[PDB]
Amino acid sequence: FDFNIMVVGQSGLGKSTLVNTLFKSQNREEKIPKTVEIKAIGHVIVKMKLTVIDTPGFGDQINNENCWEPIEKYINEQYEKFLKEEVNIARKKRIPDTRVHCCLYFISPTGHSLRPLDLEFMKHLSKVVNIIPVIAKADTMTLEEKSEFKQRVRKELEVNGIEFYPQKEFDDKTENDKIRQESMPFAVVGSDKEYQVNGKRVLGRKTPWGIIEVENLNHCEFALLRDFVIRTHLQDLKEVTHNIHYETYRAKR
Numbered sequence: 001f002d003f004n005i006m007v008v009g010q011s012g013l014g015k016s017t018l019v020n021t022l023f024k025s026q027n028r029e030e031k032i033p034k035t036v037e038i039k040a041i042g043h044v045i046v047k048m049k050l051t052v053i054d055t056p057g058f059g060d061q062i063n064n065e066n067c068w069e070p071i072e073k074y075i076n077e078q079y080e081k082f083l084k085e086e087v088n089i090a091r092k093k094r095i096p097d098t099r100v101h102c103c104l105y106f107i108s109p110t111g112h113s114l115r116p117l118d119l120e121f122m123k124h125l126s127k128v129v130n131i132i133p134v135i136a137k138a139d140t141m142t143l144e145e146k147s148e149f150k151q152r153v154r155k156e157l158e159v160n161g162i163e164f165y166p167q168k169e170f171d172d173k174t175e176n177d178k179i180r181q182e183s184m185p186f187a188v189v190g191s192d193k194e195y196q197v198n199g200k201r202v203l204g205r206k207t208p209w210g211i212i213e214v215e216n217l218n219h220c221e222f223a224l225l226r227d228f229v230i231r232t233h234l235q236d237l238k239e240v241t242h243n244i245h246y247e248t249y250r251a252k253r
């Protein structure tokens, strides 16, 4: 039972922190280093082997042309691996799946229109993998700002024809419309540090004006994202990956 999630997005958006938050919500609090290479972190949780693929952020160069190619390369490498092991010569009953089933795309909360780089990046990934749009560091927005920006992001994904998951043509539609039009993009806060609020140990960030709680729906939507990818839509993510994306890959070969 393998499930593989990738995080991608501009450097400094809290991708690695959210990776740790995902695992920890499911005992030291050391500083998280800037990510230099693509690394697959796997832990066993019925029993599910959850692997999260951390990636070096992009967009930190003067010229960011073709910066998506390392990510595309990794994704295609897992397809090629699965393709080659499908021919189960070893006669194994179960075949290991390292294919990216889900890609969280981190969007910086600028309050303005989506950046051409992100639009191009998402356009590329959307045709090879399931992408889920996430607004990073949601604590940097007020309530009013966040509502406006979520609406703006939805509109701009729509006008640019970015087919993020759940792709409309794969539906349930009552639940999904709620997802595409209300739940997404998930505005998240990450932290693998714990604090005490009203007696409860909670994952959060401690500011001079208050404590931001990661799993508190009054503060952010990390809980909704986690539930979505780990519980309610996990099998569906795997199904679209195998039957649509991987088959698209297989045919292109």
Ligand SMILES: Nc1nc2c(ncn2[C@@H]2O[C@H](COP(=O)(O)OP(=O)(O)NP(=O)(O)O)[C@@H](O)[C@H]2O)c(=O)[nH]1
Binding pocket: 009, 010, 011, 012, 013, 014, 015, 016, 017, 018, 032, 033, 034, 035, 036, 055, 056, 057, 058, 136, 137, 138, 139, 140, 188, 189, 190, 191
């Ligand atoms: N305000 C805020 N800061 C956050 C949040 N998550 C992480 N940070 C902080 O943002 C900084 C960068 O986090 P990091 O997880 O390393 O980002 P990254 O996207 O992995 N960077 P890279 O792609 O270079 O490896 C750290 O100081 C971290 O504590 C968040 O939700 N809100």
Ligand SMILES: [Mg+2]
Binding pocket: 015, 016, 017, 033, 034, 035, 054, 055, 056, 057
């Ligand atoms: Mg990182």
